[PDB]
Assembly symmetry: C3
C-alpha cells in the first residue's frame, strides 16, 4: 500500500500456514501475525520504530486475543461506527435499515480464558511508549444473558503494564463490560472518543500521572464506572459529556491534585461523582451536574443501590475546591430514598479543609446543598445556598450564606 514494510492493511495480510484465516474470520489472529512480523524485522533497541495496522471499514470477527507488546504500534481504522444496541435490543425493529455497529467494526468474541480483545502488555522493559489506538469500533455484540445486563466478561483495550505517551482517540466502544482499561498510565490522552453502552467505560487503574481525559462522550451501566481513576496525580478531566447509567460518572479513589473542570454530567442515581479514600487537593469546578430520573422503560426499576443522602458529589478527603458548579436536581418525590428525606447535593463525608464556593443548586424538592459529616474539619462553605440549605454536623464549618 505504501512503500514501507511498517504499514499493514489487515484485509491484505495472509497468515502462512493458515490460509483459511481472514480478517473477517479472526482479525485477532491476523493482527497477532502482523505483530510477529514486526518483531522479526525490528530486532534491536535501535531499530524498533513500530508500525501502523490499517483497518478498512467492514465487519470483522475477533476470536483471538491480540497481544500488543511493541512501542509505537498504531492501530487505526476509518470511523468509530457507533450504534445503540441498547435501543435496538429494547424496541420493535421491524423495517430497520441497520441492526449493528459498523465503521471499522471489530466484533469482540474473545474466550473466557482470554477476555480482552487487545491486551497491551510487556513484562520486559522499559515501559511501553507511544502506542496509538484510533478511529475504529470495538463491539462486544451482546450482553449476558440478556441485553440489559451490562455483563459479558469482555474488555476492548486493556493496558496492563506501566506505559508512557499512549494516545486513544476517535474510537467507538459499545456493549463491552469494560471498554478501556489503562494501568499505570503516564502522559496518557483519552481524547475525543465515543464510549457508551458499556458496563464500564474508562478505568485508569493502579496509579498514574500527567494524564488528560478530554472531549469524550461517555455512558456506562448501573453496576460499573464511567470514568474511574485510582491513585492518579495531576489528572485533567475536561470538556467531557458524561451521561447514562453508570453507577457513577466520575469516581476517584486516592487521587490527588487532579482537576475535573468544564465537563457536563448527567446521571439518574445518587453518587454521580465520588471522591473516595483520601482524594486531596483536587479542583472540581465549572461543571454542570444534572441529577434526574430514568426515562427508558426497560431500566425504570434498576438503581445503583444508593440513597439520596449519598450526595450528587460524595467527597472523602482533604483540601478539595468544589466551586463554580451548577447542580440541577429533579427527582419525583416517590422516587427519593429514604422516603421523605431531603436529598444531599454535596456530601463531605470526611476530611480536612474542603472549600465549597459559589455553587448554584436548583431542585424540585427541599434539598441540602451541602452536608458536612460530623468528622469533617476546617471546612468552608461560601455562596452555595441560604443557611437553611447548609447542614454541618461538624461544629467547626465556616458558612457564608448566599445573600
Amino acid at each position: 500500500p505504501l512503500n514501507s514494510p511498517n504499514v499493514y492493511d489487515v484485509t491484505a495480510w495472509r497468515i502462512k500456514g493458515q490460509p483459511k484465516v481472514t480478517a473477517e474470520s479472526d482479525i485477532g489472529a491476523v493482527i497477532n501475525d502482523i505483530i510477529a512480523d514486526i518483531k522479526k524485522r525490528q530486532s534491536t533497541p535501535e531499530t524498533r520504530p513500530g508500525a501502523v495496522v490499517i483497518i478498512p471499514p467492514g465487519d470483522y470477527d475477533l476470536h483471538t486475543q491480540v497481544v500488543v507488546d511493541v512501542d509505537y504500534l498504531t492501530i487505526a481504522g476509518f470511523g468509530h461506527g457507533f450504534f445503540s444496541r441498547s435501543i435496538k435490543d429494547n424496541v420493535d425493529t421491524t423495517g430497520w435499515l441497520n441492526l449493528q455497529p459498523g465503521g471499522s467494526h471489530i466484533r469482540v468474541l474473545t474466550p473466557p480464558t482470554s477476555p480482552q480483545a487487545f491486551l497491551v502488555r510487556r513484562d520486559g522493559s522499559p515501559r511501553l511508549s507511544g502506542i496509538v489506538f484510533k478511529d475504529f469500533c470495538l463491539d462486544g455484540v451482546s450482553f449476558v444473558p440478556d441485553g440489559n445486563s451490562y455483563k459479558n466478561g469482555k474488555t476492548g483495550i486493556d493496558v496492563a503494564s506501566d506505559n508512557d505517551s499512549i494516545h486513544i482517540t476517535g474510537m467507538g466502544f459499545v456493549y463491552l463490560e469494560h471498554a478501556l482499561i489503562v494501568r499505570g498510565a503516564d502522559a496518557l490522552r483519552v481524547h475525543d472518543n465515543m464510549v457508551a453502552e458499556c458496563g464500564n467505560c474508562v478505568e485508569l487503574t493502579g496509579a498514574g500521572q500527567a494524564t488528560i481525559v478530554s472531549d469524550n462522550l461517555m455512558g456506562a451501566g448501573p453496576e460499573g464506572v464511567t470514568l474511574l481513576a485510582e491513585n492518579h496525580e495531576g489528572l485533567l478531566v475536561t470538556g467531557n459529556n458524561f451521561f447514562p447509567r453508570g453507577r457513577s460518572l466520575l469516581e476517584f479513589t486516592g487521587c490527588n491534585r487532579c482537576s475535573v473542570t468544564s465537563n457536563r454530567f448527567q446521571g439518574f442515581y445518587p453518587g454521580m461523582m465520588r471522591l473516595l479514600n483520601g482524594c486531596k487537593e483536587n479542583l472540581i469546578t465549572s461543571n454542570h451536574f444534572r441529577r434526574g430520573t430514568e426515562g427508558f422503560p426497560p431500566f425504570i426499576d434498576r438503581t445503583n443501590g444508593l440513597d439520596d443522602l449519598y450526595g450528587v458529589i460524595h467527597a472523602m478527603g482533604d483540601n478539595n475546591l468544589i466551586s463554580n458548579n451548577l447542580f440541577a436536581y429533579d427527582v419525583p418525590p416517590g422516587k427519593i430514598a429514604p422516603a421523605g428525606a431531603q436529598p444531599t447535593i454535596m456530601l463531605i463525608a470526611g476530611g480536612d479543609g474542603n472549600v465549597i464556593a459559589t455553587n448554584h443548586v436548583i431542585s424540585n424538592v427541599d434539598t441540602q446543598h451541602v452536608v458536612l459529616d460530623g468528622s469533617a474539619t476546617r471546612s468552608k462553605v461560601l455562596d452555595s445556598g441560604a443557611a437553611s440549605t447548609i447542614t454541618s454536623y461538624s461544629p467547626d464549618t465556616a458558612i457564608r450564606p448566599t445573600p
Copy 2:
C-alpha cells in the same frame, strides 16, 4: 488502494455509463455513484458497516448535491485548506501567489433547488449513526450580489434527520450556511475552522448530549456563529469565536447546557443570547471582548441592536453566569443610543439567576448588570460596584464588589 471494497479514492473512481465525469468536473456525481455502490453491496440490515471516501488534495467542483443516507460513511481529505477570501475580495491582490482555498478543496457550485453540498438524510429507521466528515474544505466560492453580502444560498453540510454519534478537522469558507445539524444526539463538532460564512454552526430542532469544542469560528452580520434550538446538555468549550456574526452564541429554549472556557470577540451588541426561556445553564470561565469593526468595507455594518441589549442577553430561569471577563471598548460616537451607558449583562427576565465573580472593564461608564423589572430572586455577587448594577426588580440580592 487497500484490499477492501469499502475504501474509495475519488480520483480513481469511474462512473459506469458516464466515463467522462471526473472528481474534478463533478465530485458530487462521483460520491453519489460511490454511495450507490455501497448500497448495492451492503444489501441487508446486518451487512451495512459503511465505508470511507477519500479526497486527495486538489480542486474539485461539486455540481450535484450528495445525498448521504447510509450509516458509518466517512468522507475524509488531507487538509482543511482555509483561505481568507474576504481579504482577497477587498484588497489589491497584485502579485498574490494564491487566490483561493485549497487542501482537499470542494468548490460548492450546487443548483439553487438543492443548494446543500452534502445532504444527510434518511426516511426510515433507525436514526443515521456514526457518520464522519473530516479533513477537507468546503468552499462556496463567492458571495452575491457582491463579495461582502455573506449571501449565496449555499450550505456545506446539512443533516436533516435525527442522528446519533456523528463526528465533524474541516474548513468552511464563503458558504451562507456552513453546517446544520437537526436532531443531534451525541454529536461532536470538534477542532474545525469555520469562518467567513453567513452562518457557521446551526444545531436545529432539538438535541442532546452534544459537544462543540476547540473550533475557530467567525460568521456574518445577518447570521449566527453558533446556534442551538431546544438542546439539553449541550457543552460548548474551548472555542475561539470571533468575527462578525450578528451573535457569537445563540441559544433558544436550551436547558441544562454549559458554555465554559471559550473566547468571544464581537463588534456588535448581543454577542451571547439566551432566548425564549433558557434555564439552568452554566455560562462560566469565558472571555468576552466587545470591540468595534476595524476593516473598512464593514465599518458601517450593524446587526440592528443597540448597546442596551447586552453583551449577554438572557431570558430564563436559574442560570449561573460566573467567572467571566468582559472587556468593552467602543468609541463614544459608535454607542447607541447616543449618551447611553452600555449594558454588559442583561437579565431580560426569569427566576433565580445568579451572577457571580465577573470582572468588567470598559472605556466608558457601563452598567455591569441590568436586571429587568420582571426578574425574580436574582443574585448579583462581586460583579461590580453598586453604581454599576441596575435592578428594576425589587427583590434582587446585591453584593457590590468591595470598595
Copy 3:
C-alpha cells in the same frame, strides 16, 4: 498510492539523478524535492491546492532543512512516537527493548547554520495559509554536552512568516532545544500534541490573534519556556497539562485580552506562570497549580534563578481576573529561597484594577496567598485566604478575607 499527483509517500519518492538520497538517509532533501515537484505542477495562483506528504512509521534522518513556502501543505505520519530519552540517559538500561523514539520518526540532524528541521516561510503575499503538521515525531536525538543540558541548537518547526489557519496536531516533539515556534500567528491551532523533554516547547512570537492552544501535554527545560506568547490578543489556552522543568509553564509578554482556563500546571520552581510587561484584561481561571520540588536525582540542584517571593503567579498589568484556581504548594523548608522566607503564591507586581477571587491555597509551610506591590492600584482580593495570608503594600486594595 492514490490516483492523484498531490499525494506523496516519502518512502516511494525517488530523487531523479540522486538514487542514494532516501527518506532514511535524508528525509529533508526528499521533502524539498517533493516541494519542487508541487511548484512545477501547481503553477498559477489559481492552481495551487497544495499536497499531502505521507510518512510511514520508520527511522528517518534529516540533514537538510525543509523550507515550506506553499499553502495547504500537509505533512502527516501515523504516530507521534514519543519516548523518554531523559529517563533513558539517566538510568540503567540493561535489557531495555528500545532506546529511542519511534512512530513516524524524524531524527533532526541539521547543520549549525540552518538549525530548524522545518522552516515555514514565504517572502511575498499573501500569508501562508492552511498548513498542517500532524501525527509524526521530531527527535533532536541528543543534548550536549550531556543529555541533561537541554541544549543542541535544534528547532523542530519554525514558522517565520505571518500565517493564517495553520494546524499542528497529534505531534510528538522530543530532545529539541526549540520544539515549535510560530511568528505572526492568526487563527493557529496547536492541539492534542506531546511536546516534552525539549528546552522550549511552544513559542508564539512577534504578535498574534485568535489562536487556540489546547489538549496538549507539555514539559520544557530549566532555561526555556513551555508555552510563551508575545503580544497576542485573544489567545485561548485550555485543556492543557503542563508539567516538568521549564523555567516557566506559561509566559505571556504584552498579551492582552487572552484566556487561560481549565489547565493543569505542575512546576518545580517559582514563576510557573508569568504575565509580564503590561499584560491587560486577561482571564486566568479554573486552573490547578502544583508547585513541588524536583524528584529526579540528576536535576535536584537545577534552579531557574528565582526565589519563592517571585510568585507561583507573577502578574504585571491591568484588569486581569485571577479566579477560581487551586494552588497546592509543597516545598521543604530547606529548599525554599531565600532561607526562612514565606513563599508567595500570587504576586501582583504592579498595575491597575486586578481582581483575585475565590482561590484555594494549601501549603506545607506558611505562605502569603496574595502579595500586592506598593504601586498596584484599585486591586480587589476576595476569598483567596484569611487576612493573615493577604499582604497589600498598596493602600487602596479592597480585601475580603475567606470567612473564619
